[PDB]
Amino acid sequence: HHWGYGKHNGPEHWHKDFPIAKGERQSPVDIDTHTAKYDPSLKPLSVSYDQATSLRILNNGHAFNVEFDDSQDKAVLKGGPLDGTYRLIQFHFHWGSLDGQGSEHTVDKKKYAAELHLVHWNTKYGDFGKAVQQPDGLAVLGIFLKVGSAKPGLQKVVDVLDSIKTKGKSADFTNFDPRGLLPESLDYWTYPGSLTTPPLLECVTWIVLKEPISVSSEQVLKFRKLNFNGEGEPEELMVDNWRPAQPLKNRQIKASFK
């Protein structure tokens, strides 16, 4: 059948239907902090989310997405490694069944409990679908989650998860401010990579923040109560929806800080 995260349809099988799974710039990767290099040429990173307009939250059977209105430059990412303007279209998470796993990227082989992906597309290509046919189509801002104190800006997302328990469910989710999900520091690593799920397209400039956010044990537990299945099908808890680290191959990770 179709792809997911189980023994019979998980990451080790994806290459049969998406041969680019074995390509030259796949994601995620392990970030070896001693081999990353500070790059003084990177420009200041600009996360400009004051006019972000959230619309809806959806369980898609792989994770849940909070979607935004991207018909104008209301929430954009620029600077850093980026040329041009990238519009926020959605964010989602990947997380584990246990606190010691769940992130896609790792840092010196350390796994975090979860990872937040804020997905943006390069406005020069007109729409998201054209962007994913380009090698500089997308920029994804990745943020690690560790378990500790609650993240107040996450709580509204946690509060609505009961209404999207199963695949295909959605709920109105307006007036959500994604600035509440950021850590204090915007220091980051960056490298060229891919989508971390099928179709695994190699279109992404990854920007991974050094500083994790903390979320509470009750907040991560609520992610783990979601279902991969649809309503009325047998229950399969949505956990461990992460792809493991892939070969770096011919890429150097750059750092915005020393």
Structure tokens at 78: 């620029």
Candidate ranges 28-36, 81-89, 115-123, 243-251; the one touching Zn ion (CB under 5 A): 115-123
Taking the complex as a whole, the smallest distance from the CB of residue 21 to Zn ion amounts, in Å, to 15
For position 105 contacting Zn ion by CB under 5 A, the verdict is no
197 labelled as ligand-binding? yes
In the numeric block, the tokens 């997405």 are attached to 65
**Residue of 1, 13, 15, 62 marked catalytic:** 62
Q: Which residue is nearest to Zn ion, using beta carbons?
A: 117
Instruction: Respond yes or no: is residue 62 known to be catalytic.
Output: yes
Task: Using alpha carbons, list the distances in angstroms from residue 67 to 15, 27, 70.
Answer: 28, 22, 9
92 labelled as ligand-binding? yes
Choose which of 78, 87, 111, 117 interacts with Zn ion (CB under 5 A): 117
For position 78 contacting Zn ion by CB under 5 A, the verdict is no
Alpha-carbon dihedral sign for residues 42, 104, 21, 234: negative
Gap between the Cα atoms of 73 and 257, Å rounded? 28
Q: Which residues 170-209 are close enough to bind Zn ion by CB under 5 A?
A: none
Candidate ranges 36-44, 109-117, 157-165, 213-221; the one touching Zn ion (CB under 5 A): 109-117
Gap between the Cα atoms of 15 and 23, Å rounded? 10
Task: Identify which of residues 78 and 117 has a Cβ nearer to Zn ion in the complex.
Answer: 117
Taking the complex as a whole, the smallest distance from the CB of residue 40 to Zn ion amounts, in Å, to 29
Tally of CA atoms within 13 A in the half-sphere of 93 that contains its CB? 28
Taking the complex as a whole, the smallest distance from the CB of residue 251 to Zn ion amounts, in Å, to 19
Q: 191-219 burial by CB neighbour count: b if 16+ within 10 A, else e?
A: bbbbbbbbebbbbbbbbbbbebbbbbeeb
Q: List the binding residues.
A: 92, 94, 117, 196-197
Residues annotated as catalytic are 62
Q: Annotated binding site for substrate: which residue ranges?
A: 196-197
